[PDB]
């Protein structure tokens, strides 16, 4: 665990394209969307949605959930080699999948909906959850070992009407799985004190802005609160799903999140989907109840719109932003690696960066200044004894399929 700890404008990062080993075929009017990436213990999980036509309004063609091994492909660069792919029969009904690795399998928790994205149709969505277990090293003659699908029926939600997985990847603790999740709570039941919304140095802010922006709109029936979905494998019997709400310290609207293992401890990231646009990440103080020691990070934010653009800090009623997580690679110096979008109000210009709380040590663009890019997911790991990070980046091809790309970036030990 040696990395360069000195800032430099030199380009010491050499990103490698590693999408060659994944089944992301390119065609005329095929769009690949809703991606997922997880990397754990030399294995990985991946998913996307193949659409025909519009990337946002198009018809669903195929959803894939696949796992496999991350291996040195032959030139000391890691790459993802799929071993086990599952395909659901109705690809338009599967939403918000989240993968967690545990003892030889990847557990992907998905939402089932026939009304579209539950976030954008909260009241019409009838809560329906399921789980698909994929073995990272398949066996012949094994029955349900390679693939197992289970519908979830025992759900403990607490005070929330509905719960749902909400993020790319989760973490295991012993034999209990934890998934990034969100609880739908009606506004009427939401306990929040206006005096707590920090407008002190915000001349144009109003006390009500925090409470209003906990839903996708001010008059939304529900507010969204992020949290965890808990599944204890040692219990057995009929599976029980348990929602754990996140603590109210630095509370923002429920947004896609990630809880992950780094150097032996759980770390959390939450997408900034409203007015608090500085990156939200940090070590988990307690898993249950869920409390995060958010970093006071002053250098990384996310693109928004005109009401809460990049670097906005003062409370407004806005539902804007992108998911751009970061991965802690050094807890002693609290250094992280991730891709951010270098644009104030549009999703473009992706830049892979290694940074502390108040300083970007080094970084490198992943495309041209103008290239469109939305979601990015970064997971880091050891390959032999070398530190690598793998970054999934949604990228738009001006010429052509608009699809995710995969980059491997080696983190230098020296400067």
């Amino acid at each position: 665990n040696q990395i360069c700890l000195q800032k430099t404008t030199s380009t010491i990062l050499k990103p490698r394209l590693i999408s060659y080993t994944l089944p992301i075929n390119t065609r005329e009017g095929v769009c690949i969307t809703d991606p997922l990436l997880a990397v754990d213990n030399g294995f990985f999980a991946y998913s996307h949605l193949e659409k025909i036509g519009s990337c946002t309004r198009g018809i669903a063609k195929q959803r894939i959930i696949g796992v496999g091994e991350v291996l040195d492909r032959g030139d000391k660069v890691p790459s993802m080699f799929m071993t086990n792919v599952w395909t659901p029969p109705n690809p338009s009904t599967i939403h918000h999948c989240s993968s967690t690795y545990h003892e030889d399998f990847y557990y992907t928790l998905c939402a089932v909906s026939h009304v579209g994205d539950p976030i954008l149709n909260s009241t019409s969505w009838t809560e329906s959850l399921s789980l698909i277990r994929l073995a990272v090293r398949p066996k012949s003659d094994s029955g349900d070992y390679n693939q197992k699908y289970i519908a979830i029926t025992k759900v403990e939600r607490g005070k929330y009407d509905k719960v749902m997985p909400y993020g790319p990847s989760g973490i295991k603790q012993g034999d209990t799985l934890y998934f990034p999740a969100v609880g739908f709570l009606p506004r009427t039941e939401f306990q929040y004190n206006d005096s707590n919304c920090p407008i002190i140095h915000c001349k144009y802010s109003k006390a009500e802005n925090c409470r209003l922006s906990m839903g996708v709109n001010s008059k939304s029936h529900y507010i969204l609160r992020s949290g965890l979905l808990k599944y204890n494998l040692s219990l057995g019997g009929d599976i029980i799903l348990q929602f754990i709400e996140i603590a109210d310290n630095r509370l923002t609207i429920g947004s896609p999140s990630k809880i992950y293992n780094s150097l032996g401890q759980p770390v959390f990231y939450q997408a900034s989907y409203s007015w608090d646009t500085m990156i939200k990440l940090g070590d988990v103080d307690t898993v249950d109840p869920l409390r995060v020691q958010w970093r006071n990070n002053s250098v990384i934010s996310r693109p928004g719109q005109s009401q809460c653009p990049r670097f906005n800090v003062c409370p407004e009623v806005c539902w804007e932003g992108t998911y751009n997580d970061a991965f802690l690679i050094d807890r002693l110096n609290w250094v992280s690696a991730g891709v951010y979008l270098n644009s104030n109000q549009t999703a473009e210009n992706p830049v892979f960066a290694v940074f502390k709380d108040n300083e970007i040590l080094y970084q490198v663009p992943l495309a041209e200044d103008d290239t469109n890019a939305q979601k990015t997911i970064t997971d880091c790991f050891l390959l032999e004894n070398v530190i690598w990070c793998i970054s999934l980046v949604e990228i738009y091809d001006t010429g052509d399929v608009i699809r995710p790309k995969l980059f491997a970036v080696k983190i230098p030990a020296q400067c």
Epitope: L120, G304, S306, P309, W319, G321, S343, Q345
Partner: antibody, heavy 127, light 109 residues
Framework: EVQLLESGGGLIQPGGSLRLSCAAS????????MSWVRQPPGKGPEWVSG????????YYADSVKGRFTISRDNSKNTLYLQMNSLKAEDTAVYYC????????????????????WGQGTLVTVSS | SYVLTQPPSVSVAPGQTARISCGGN??????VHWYQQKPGQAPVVVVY???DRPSGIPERFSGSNSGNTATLTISRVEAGDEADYYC???????????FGGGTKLTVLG
């Protein structure tokens, strides 16, 4: 229906100051980004400045930064433009313009477009 | 600072189908909007976000964006359609709204 009604234009010498107003109705004023777009005679429009619904963020074009001020009184549903140290090239028709997007999206392909425009107010900087 | 380039003049006859161009470097990396300006009036949006159509705008006005040129094609062109057409984007390298120079659409009665 949405109406935007500009006023305050007139004749002024170079180096003077004028204040434009825009009266807005038909929508919740404080939830939309508002902008001033000017059109010099015989030329196309030019974006001058914009302001977020609360007024927390103000945006300016380089040609205008440091001389004009965009502000907004939400209790009066009024958008303002204080133009100072006016130059001859500022001569144009100045439009109130409302951001046309309504809906819930996390990101927008085009985060700034205009619907509708006011009918405009004419500013003549001349000696 | 980002530059949008338009042809200054375009002519058709009544009911003929016209095509107006908005050129910018890698303009497919930007969302394009189109405005129509009849003489003595304020501009009016006819296309937003490359191809989306605002309600109240006839379907014959269509927009598209690809590569280095966006195009606003109008079919069944009519004497009412004689106006100036401007394209418009957001430049995130300058945080500026940028307009094109405009295209005079002439239909000869």
């Amino acid at each position: 229906e949405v109406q935007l009604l500009e006023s305050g234009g007139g004749l002024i010498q170079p180096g003077g100051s004028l204040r434009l107003s825009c009266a807005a109705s038909g929508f919740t004023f404080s939830r939309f980004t508002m902008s001033w777009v000017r059109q010099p005679p015989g030329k196309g429009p030019e974006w001058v400045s914009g302001i977020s619904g609360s007024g927390g963020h103000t945006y300016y074009a380089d040609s205008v930064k440091g001389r004009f001020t965009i502000s907004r009184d939400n209790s009066k549903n009024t958008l303002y433009l204080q133009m100072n140290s006016l130059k001859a090239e500022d001569t144009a028709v100045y439009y109130c313009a409302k951001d046309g997007f309504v809906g819930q999206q996390l990101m927008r392909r085009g985060p700034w477009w205009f619907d509708p425009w006011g009918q405009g107010t004419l500013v003549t900087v001349s000696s | 600072s980002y530059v949008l380039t338009q042809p200054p003049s375009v002519s058709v006859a009544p009911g003929q189908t016209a095509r107006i161009s908005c050129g910018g470097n890698n303009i497919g990396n930007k969302g394009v909007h189109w405005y129509q300006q009849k003489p003595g009036q304020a501009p009016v949006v006819v296309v937003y976000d490359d191809s989306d159509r605002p309600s109240g705008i006839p379907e014959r006005f269509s927009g598209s964006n690809s590569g280095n040129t966006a195009t606003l094609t109008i079919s069944r062109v009519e004497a009412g359609d004689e106006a100036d057409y401007y394209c418009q984007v957001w430049d995130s390298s300058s945080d500026h709204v940028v307009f094109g120079g405009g295209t005079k659409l002439t239909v000869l009665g």
